Amino acid sequence: LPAHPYDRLKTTSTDPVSDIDVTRREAYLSSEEFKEKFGMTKEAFYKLPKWKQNKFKMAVQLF
């Protein structure tokens, strides 16, 4: 599926999207950028708990 760049994606941005996991807006980024901002890949990041997943998300301004 299509993804959006971090430069266009913000923690509280209202920009348009491709209609994906709203709860996982941060995932809207590419495996490279996303993992580059969270320091963890898809399987690596997703592995973390919900409480931690929501924390890191906003941590990189991605929520």
Side-chain angles (χ1 to χ4, degrees):
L1 37 63
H4 318 301
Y6 180 98
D7 205 301
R8 218 104 104 81
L9 224 85
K10 221 108 70 243
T11 347
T12 48
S13 146
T14 351
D15 268 44
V17 278
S18 212
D19 202 352
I20 8 182
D21 302 284
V22 177
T23 177
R24 313 202 291 196
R25 179 109 117 277
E26 73 293 328
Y28 295 175
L29 250 170
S30 269
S31 65
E32 310 228 43
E33 270 289 287
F34 163 94
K35 89 182 198 224
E36 268 278 307
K37 261 59 257 245
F38 297 113
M40 325 210 93
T41 349
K42 253 202 252 255
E43 235 179 65
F45 191 96
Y46 286 136
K47 243 282 134 85
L48 277 173
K50 271 90 203 198
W51 78 270
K52 188 120 157 132
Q53 262 216 88
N54 253 30
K55 290 272 202 110
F56 241 135
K57 260 151 225 225
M58 57 187 233
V60 324
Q61 316 174 68
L62 280 186
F63 191 83

